[PDB]
């Protein structure tokens, strides 16, 4: 059985969040918490909050053993962007993309 959580429209950009999200996938659920507490990226308190949420949906909703779970899927999709402008020089604006992310981690124990 699998347990998932998502975080939709997180204001961290998708390229910046997929760095730290590559560090934790495939790894067991206990040590993935320890990686997300020690990397000093901006995304590390956000994926950790989502990994807490999917380990909680495992214990509560599906009654899994949260001690032995492994992070199967850990991906971040693109969300809707906020298109901002920026005045540079000589009356000439340039677009700034405030990108958002849908962060999704799923967790399981590998059994059916």
């Amino acid at each position: 059985m699998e347990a998932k959580a998502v975080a939709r429209t997180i204001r961290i950009a998708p390229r910046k969040v997929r760095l730290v999200l590559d560090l934790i996938r495939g790894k067991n659920a206990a040590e993935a918490i320890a990686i997300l507490k020690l990397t000093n990226k901006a995304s590390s308190p956000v994926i950790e909050k989502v990994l807490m949420s999917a380990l909680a949906n495992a214990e509560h909703n599906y009654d899994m053993n949260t001690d032995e779970l492994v992070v199967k899927e850990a991906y971040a999709n693109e969300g809707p962007t906020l298109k901002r402008f920026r005045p540079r020089a000589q009356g000439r604006a340039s677009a700034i993309n405030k990108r958002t992310s849908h962060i999704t981690i799923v967790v399981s124990d590998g059994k059916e």
Partner: protein
């Protein structure tokens, strides 16, 4: 000054193969708490 050609999806992904990030220290605190960063004293949720 400007790129004469666009970079492809293949050439872009070959460039950023070293655009990675490392796993940190991750040593246990033997007194109490969770994993601390190596050679560091803990502040929260640990006794180092």
């Amino acid at each position: 000054a400007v790129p004469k050609r666009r970079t492809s999806k293949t050439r872009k992904n070959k460039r950023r193969t070293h655009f990675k990030i490392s796993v940190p220290g991750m040593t246990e605190c033997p007194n109490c708490g969770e994993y601390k960063l190596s050679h560091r004293v803990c502040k929260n949720c640990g006794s180092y």
